[PDB]
Design a protein around this ligand. Structure first.
Ligand SMILES: [Cl-]
Length: 129
């Protein structure tokens, strides 16, 4: 499913991302826009053979199992396909684990290059939250 901007903001707020580990909601909506264009079914393969899955492009080397990434950990204990669902619960729950790992939202390269240090409140402007 492809979310609208405010629809995703509301869903993320309901699942407890607003100010999670100090990251306001706009940071999570900006990261989803530039990682997946708000598409839950986005996938992208990387040079190392791992693949990134879903609205927040979560990687199979560390976080989920896709059966084709040798030596990967599956820290979120989920098949990577669960991250492609129209229900974003599994992606949010795994993202909370990733943002707690020590480097905060710098784990998402699009957030660091396209959202960090910008006016991220713009991503939630106008929305009924
Ligand atoms: Cl980037």
């Amino acid at each position: 499913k492809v979310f609208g901007r405010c629809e995703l903001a509301a869903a993320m707020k309901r699942h407890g991302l607003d100010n999670y580990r100090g990251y306001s909601l706009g940071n999570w909506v900006c990261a989803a826009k530039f990682e997946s264009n708000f598409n839950t079914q986005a996938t992208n393969r990387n040079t190392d053979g791992s693949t990134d899955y879903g609205i927040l492009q979560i990687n199979s080397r560390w976080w989920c199992n896709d059966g084709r990434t040798p030596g990967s950990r599956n820290l979120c204990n989920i098949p990577c396909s669960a991250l492609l669902s129209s229900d974003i619960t599994a992606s949010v729950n795994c993202a909370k684990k990733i943002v707690s790992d020590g480097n905060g939202m710098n784990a998402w390269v699009a957030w660091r290059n396209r959202c960090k240090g910008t006016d991220v409140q713009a991503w939630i402007r106008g929305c009924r939250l």
